[PDB]
Write a protein that binds this ligand. Structure first.
Ligand SMILES: *[C@@H]1O[C@H](CO)[C@@H](O)[C@H](O)[C@H]1NC(C)=O
Lengths: 45, 73
Protein backbone atom coordinates (compact mmCIF):
# COMPACT_ATOMS: atom_id res chain seq x y z
CA UNK A 1 0.00 0.00 0.00
CA UNK A 2 1.71 3.17 -1.22
CA UNK A 3 -0.71 5.48 0.60
CA UNK A 4 0.56 4.64 4.12
CA UNK A 5 4.26 4.85 3.21
CA UNK A 6 6.08 6.58 6.08
CA UNK A 7 9.44 8.38 5.90
CA UNK A 8 11.41 9.33 9.03
CA UNK A 9 14.73 11.14 9.35
CA UNK A 10 16.85 12.43 12.22
CA UNK A 11 15.68 15.48 14.17
CA UNK A 12 16.69 17.50 17.24
CA UNK A 13 14.31 16.51 20.09
CA UNK A 14 15.75 18.04 23.27
CA UNK A 15 13.54 18.61 26.35
CA UNK A 16 17.88 17.22 45.23
CA UNK A 17 18.54 18.90 48.58
CA UNK A 18 16.98 19.13 52.04
CA UNK A 19 17.36 22.02 54.48
CA UNK A 20 15.27 24.00 56.97
CA UNK A 21 16.51 26.79 59.25
CA UNK A 22 14.84 27.53 62.60
CA UNK A 23 15.63 30.67 64.60
CA UNK A 24 17.16 29.50 67.90
CA UNK A 25 17.16 26.84 70.61
CA UNK A 26 20.31 27.15 72.78
CA UNK A 27 20.59 25.21 76.06
CA UNK A 28 22.00 26.20 79.45
CA UNK A 29 25.49 27.28 78.41
CA UNK A 30 28.25 27.67 81.03
CA UNK A 31 26.65 25.39 83.62
CA UNK A 32 28.63 25.99 86.83
CA UNK A 33 28.06 28.10 89.97
CA UNK A 34 28.14 27.87 93.77
CA UNK A 35 26.29 29.42 96.74
CA UNK A 36 28.64 28.71 99.66
CA UNK A 37 31.46 31.28 99.69
CA UNK A 38 29.04 34.21 99.52
CA UNK A 39 26.88 32.44 102.10
CA UNK A 40 30.00 32.01 104.24
CA UNK A 41 30.72 35.75 103.98
CA UNK A 42 27.17 36.84 104.81
CA UNK A 43 26.98 34.38 107.72
CA UNK A 44 30.53 35.16 108.92
CA UNK A 45 29.84 38.89 109.29
CA UNK B 1 6.07 21.04 97.88
CA UNK B 2 8.81 18.91 99.42
CA UNK B 3 9.71 16.78 96.39
CA UNK B 4 8.39 19.12 93.71
CA UNK B 5 6.14 22.08 93.04
CA UNK B 6 2.47 21.85 92.03
CA UNK B 7 0.92 24.64 89.96
CA UNK B 8 -2.82 24.93 89.27
CA UNK B 9 -2.68 27.95 86.98
CA UNK B 10 -2.09 29.13 83.42
CA UNK B 11 1.69 29.57 83.43
CA UNK B 12 2.06 31.72 80.34
CA UNK B 13 5.74 31.73 79.34
CA UNK B 14 6.29 35.01 77.51
CA UNK B 15 9.71 33.64 76.42
CA UNK B 16 10.96 30.21 75.24
CA UNK B 17 11.08 27.06 77.33
CA UNK B 18 13.68 24.31 77.65
CA UNK B 19 13.67 20.87 79.26
CA UNK B 20 14.74 17.28 78.65
CA UNK B 21 11.69 15.12 79.47
CA UNK B 22 8.13 16.40 79.04
CA UNK B 23 5.64 14.12 80.79
CA UNK B 24 1.90 14.00 81.32
CA UNK B 25 0.06 13.24 84.52
CA UNK B 26 -0.78 9.61 85.25
CA UNK B 27 -4.52 10.23 85.69
CA UNK B 28 -4.95 12.79 82.87
CA UNK B 29 -4.22 12.58 79.15
CA UNK B 30 -1.92 15.19 77.64
CA UNK B 31 -3.59 17.31 74.98
CA UNK B 32 -1.85 19.88 72.78
CA UNK B 33 -3.86 21.97 70.30
CA UNK B 34 -3.82 25.25 68.41
CA UNK B 35 -5.68 27.07 65.65
CA UNK B 36 -3.21 27.12 62.74
CA UNK B 37 -0.96 24.05 63.17
CA UNK B 38 1.32 22.22 65.59
CA UNK B 39 4.86 21.37 64.53
CA UNK B 40 7.39 18.82 65.75
CA UNK B 41 10.92 19.47 64.52
CA UNK B 42 14.29 17.75 64.68
CA UNK B 43 17.62 19.13 63.52
CA UNK B 44 21.00 17.92 62.32
CA UNK B 45 24.30 18.86 63.99
CA UNK B 46 24.35 22.08 61.95
CA UNK B 47 20.85 22.90 63.24
CA UNK B 48 19.17 22.07 59.92
CA UNK B 49 15.63 20.83 60.51
CA UNK B 50 15.54 17.53 58.65
CA UNK B 51 12.53 15.57 59.92
CA UNK B 52 9.16 17.25 60.37
CA UNK B 53 5.92 15.83 61.78
CA UNK B 54 3.52 18.67 60.99
CA UNK B 55 -0.20 18.61 61.72
CA UNK B 56 -1.50 21.25 59.36
CA UNK B 57 -4.97 22.78 59.27
CA UNK B 58 -6.46 19.97 57.15
CA UNK B 59 -4.26 16.88 56.90
CA UNK B 60 -1.00 15.60 58.37
CA UNK B 61 2.38 15.87 56.64
CA UNK B 62 5.56 13.93 57.34
CA UNK B 63 8.79 15.13 55.73
CA UNK B 64 11.92 12.98 55.90
CA UNK B 65 14.27 10.81 53.86
CA UNK B 66 12.59 7.60 55.03
CA UNK B 67 9.39 6.40 56.67
CA UNK B 68 9.59 3.03 58.41
CA UNK B 69 6.93 1.09 60.26
CA UNK B 70 7.84 -1.84 62.50
CA UNK B 71 6.45 -3.93 65.32
CA UNK B 72 7.54 -3.66 68.95
CA UNK B 73 10.22 -6.28 68.20
C1 LIG C 1 -3.60 3.78 6.53
O1 LIG C 1 -4.25 2.63 7.09
C2 LIG C 1 -5.39 2.93 7.91
C3 LIG C 1 -5.87 1.63 8.50
O2 LIG C 1 -6.28 0.72 7.48
C4 LIG C 1 -6.45 3.64 7.07
O3 LIG C 1 -7.54 3.99 7.90
C5 LIG C 1 -5.86 4.89 6.42
O4 LIG C 1 -6.81 5.48 5.55
C6 LIG C 1 -4.59 4.54 5.64
N1 LIG C 1 -3.98 5.75 5.11
C7 LIG C 1 -3.98 6.06 3.80
C8 LIG C 1 -3.31 7.35 3.43
O5 LIG C 1 -4.49 5.32 2.96
Amino acid sequence: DWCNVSLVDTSVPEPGILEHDPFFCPPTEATARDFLADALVTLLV
Amino acid sequence: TKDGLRLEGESEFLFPLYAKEIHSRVDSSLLLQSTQNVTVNARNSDGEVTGRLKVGPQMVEVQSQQFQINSRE
